[PDB]
């Protein structure tokens, strides 16, 4: 079936029709099998550092260079700035590979998998044409099911640049049938000693009616910074995938535009200027996303995902309703078998290589709680964002601002690990 036969198939009929009764859990959704993603969600964590080079680059600047790497700006003001603004580019950067990675794969946006509790996801980006980048690891978690959350932490050793997060969504459709989508979780990137939270934006999918679904972003992420600075990125559809950011000297700044220290504008998929109190900030286009490098098949433990779901993807493919059913039932069946046999052996593995601590104000007697100068309090506070599991990028004192788990990797965890290598 062409996709231009799609949105008049019987299958897309029915498959809209129960939009209607849409019980609230997406992975319930009776998609086709020509709108079926072979990717589990585990793997979207990879997103996160497509781009190497960018990662990596805050932990270059220092005192000593800094306006020798300020691009836009070589008489950029310090090397806090001049790290915010590469910070700031990093996170434009991964926007593409985060929202557009299916459509230039597959064709349009197609349902994922949803991954198993316990799923693992690890790969590298070794790196070899940059020896002063060294490796930098991916691990990805899926932390629970029910909700589904996956957590994820990447990090370069070698230039002490490290970034942990988790991610949950909540879904409804509009009266349209758009999909509107929220999502819940932050995530941390320290360099060095300097740190940074960045939130991630609510999000639409449109295209359903056609069946051609695309992410469309829309409200604000935020960037801040433990140097008080904040860079605010705020979304809109155009013509698409735009946005423009400001960045503040601090928080109480970012209430008045007219503050800005600078503004970036254009499209996160293509190309956004940027001027000062213009120049080529990001060039989508210019740019090609390198892949992590994952182990051969052969090579994988039965919990890493495509390993897992190798079956499922071979029948998704082939677009056999059939065969997508069976192979999905079998898949079931190994990894009840597989818990049992990691149980027997001693392995933990649910919460594996993240922990879930408790922020609020009442924890339970024996609860993981943050310890007194914790990133997150300081740097939610320096933003007067909620630490509550509101969704993302909400404030103190929104409607919205209830419990306050976050997922945080436990380094030692995955340098004890019994089973899973690289
Ligand atoms: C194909 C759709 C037809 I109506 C079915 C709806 C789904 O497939 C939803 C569940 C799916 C998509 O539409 C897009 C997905 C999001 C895309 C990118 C991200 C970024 C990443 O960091 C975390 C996961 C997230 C939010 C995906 C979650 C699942 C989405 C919404």
Known sequence: MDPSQYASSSSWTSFLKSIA?????????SA?????????????????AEHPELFLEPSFINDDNYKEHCLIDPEVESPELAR??????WFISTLKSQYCSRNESLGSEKKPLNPFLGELFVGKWENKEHPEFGETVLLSEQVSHHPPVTAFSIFNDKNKVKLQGYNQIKASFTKSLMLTVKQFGHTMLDIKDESYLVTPPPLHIEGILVASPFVELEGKSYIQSSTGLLCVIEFSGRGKNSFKARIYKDSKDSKDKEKALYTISGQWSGSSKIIKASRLFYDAARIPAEHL?????????????????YDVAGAIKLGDFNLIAKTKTELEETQRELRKEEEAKGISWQRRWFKDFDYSVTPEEGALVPEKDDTFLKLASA????????????????????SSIHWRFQRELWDEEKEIVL
Do not use: C
């Open 21 to 29: 009764s849409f019980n609230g859990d997406l992975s319930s959704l």
């Open 32 to 48: 086709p099998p020509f709108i079926l993603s072979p990717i589990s969600l585990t793997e979207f964590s990879q997103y996160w």
């Open 84 to 89: 915010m603004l590469a910070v700031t580019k």
């Open 293 to 309: 490098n994952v182990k051969p098949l052969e090579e994988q433990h039965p919990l890493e995902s495509r390993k897992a779901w």
């Open 383 to 402: 933003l007067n964002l909620s630490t509550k599991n509101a969704p993302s990028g909400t404030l103190v004192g929104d409607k919205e601002d209830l």
